[PDB]
Design a protein around this ligand. Structure first.
Ligand SMILES: Nc1ncnc2c1ncn2[C@@H]1O[C@H](COP(=O)(O)OP(=O)(O)NP(=O)(O)O)[C@@H](O)[C@H]1O
Ligand SMILES: [Mg+2]
Length: 303
C-alpha cells in the first residue's frame, strides 16, 4: 500500500521522514516522502542550518503528481509543521486525496508541544491550534497526540486515566476513529519510572480501549513520536481490528530501537558521562530486524 508522508528531513539524524521512511520501507510499504524542510540536523543540537518548503512549492509537487495521475494513496502521514499556511495546504491535499480515494487512511501526528517538566509548553506558533482543531483533526482517521496535545485539542486538562479516556471520547467525535495518547504523566502501579500510553478505537459501533505502562529511560530522544506514528500506521494496517496487538508491536519496536540507542550512547560517551544529542540519535539502521518482527516485551491492559 502507498503512503504519502509529509514531514521534515535532516541530513545527519533520524527525525520526521528520516524516522518514518526506512522503517515503513522495511515493512513493505511504498512510501513517498515529501520533505517539508531540509536541515543539517534536528533543532535539539547547538546549531542547525537549512531551508524550508513553502506551501506554493508543496502545491507544485502535488500538481506534478496529479498531472501524472499519481495522486492515489492508501495513506497519508503527517507530523511536525511550523507554518499555518503549509498546514492549510496539507489539509487541501488530503481533502483531495480523500475524494480521489475515499478509503484513504489519514494518519495525523498533531505536533503542538510537550510537558518538558510539569508545566506543558507549546513548540509551535499558537495560531496552528485552530487549524488543527477545525481543519486537520476532523479530517484525520488516526491521531497520535501526547498528553499535552490531547489537552490543547480538547480544551480539558488531563490528570487521571478517566479524564484521559473522556478526552479521547471528545477527539473521537471530532472525527478520528483511532486515538492514541503516545505519552503521559499518569501514574503507574509499577513505579515512578513509568510513562503511560492510552489507546482507543471505534469500529463496526464497538470500542476497544487499551493501556500500556512503559518503563522510562533517563534520556531525551528525538524522532520517537514520529517513529510511533509510523509504526502505528504500519501495525494497524496489518491488524486492523486489533488495537491491542497493533499497539504492542508499535511500542515493542520502540523498546528495541531505544534499548540499542541507549546501550550505544552510553558506550560512545563513556561509563559515567551523560550522552550528547548526537550520541542519542536512534540507531535505526541497526534495528532493521526488530522493525520487521518485533519481539513483544510489553503486554497491553484491555480497559
Ligand atoms: N525515555 C524516553 N524518552 C522518550 N521516549 C521514550 C522513552 N522511553 C520510552 N519512550 C517511547 O517513546 C514513545 C513516544 O514518546 P515521545 O517521544 O515523548 O513522543 P510524544 O511526545 O508522545 N509525541 P510528539 O509530540 O510527536 O513528540 C513512547 O510511547 C515510548 O514508547
Ligand atoms: Mg514527548
Amino acid at each position: 500500500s502507498r503512503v504519502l508522508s509529509i514531514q521534515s528531513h535532516v541530513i545527519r539524524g533520524y527525525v520526521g521522514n528520516r524516522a518514518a521512511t526506512f522503517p515503513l520501507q522495511v515493512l513493505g510499504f511504498e512510501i513517498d516522502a515529501v520533505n517539508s524542510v531540509q536541515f543539517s540536523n534536528h533543532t535539539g543540537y547547538a546549531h542547525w542550518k537549512g531551508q524550508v518548503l513553502n506551501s506554493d512549492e508543496l502545491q507544485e509537487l502535488y500538481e506534478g503528481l496529479r498531472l501524472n495521475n499519481m495522486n492515489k494513496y492508501d495513506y497519508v502521514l503527517t507530523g511536525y509543521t511550523r507554518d499555518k499556511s503549509f498546514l492549510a495546504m496539507v489539509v487541501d491535499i488530503v481533502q483531495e486525496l480523500k475524494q480521489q480515494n475515499p478509503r484513504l487512511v489519514y494518519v495525523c501526528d498533531p505536533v503542538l508541544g510537550d510537558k518538558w517538566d510539569g508545566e506543558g509548553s507549546m513548540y509551535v506558533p499558537e495560531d496552528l491550534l485552530p487549524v488543527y482543531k477545525e481543519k486537520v483533526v476532523p479530517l484525520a482517521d488516526i491521531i497520535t497526540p501526547n498528553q499535552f496535545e490531547a489537552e490543547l485539542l480538547s480544551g480539558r486538562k488531563i490528570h487521571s486515566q478517566e479524564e484521559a479516556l473522556r478526552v479521547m471520547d471528545m477527539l473521537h467525535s471530532m472525527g478520528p476513529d483511532t486515538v492514541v495518547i503516545t505519552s503521559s504523566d499518569l501514574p503507574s502501579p509499577q513505579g515512578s519510572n513509568y510513562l503511560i500510553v492510552l489507546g482507543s478505537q471505534r469500529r463496526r459501533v464497538v470500542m476497544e480501549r487499551i493501556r500500556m505502562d512503559i518503563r522510562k529511560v533517563d534520556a531525551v530522544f528525538v524522532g520517537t513520536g514520529d517513529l510511533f506514528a509510523a509504526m502505528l500506521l504500519a501495525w494497524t494496517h496489518k491488524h486492523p481490528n486489533n488495537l491491542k496487538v497493533a499497539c504492542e508491536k508499535t511500542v515493542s519496536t520502540l523498546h528495541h530501537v531505544l534499548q540499542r540507542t541507549i546501550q550505544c550512547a552510553k558506550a560512545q560517551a563513556g561509563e559515567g558521562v551523560r550522552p550528547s544529542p548526537m550520541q542519542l540519535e536512534l540507531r535505526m539502521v541497526q534495528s532493521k530486524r526488530d522493525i520487521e518482527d518485533p519481539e513483544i516485551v510489553v503486554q497491553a491492559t484491555v480497559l
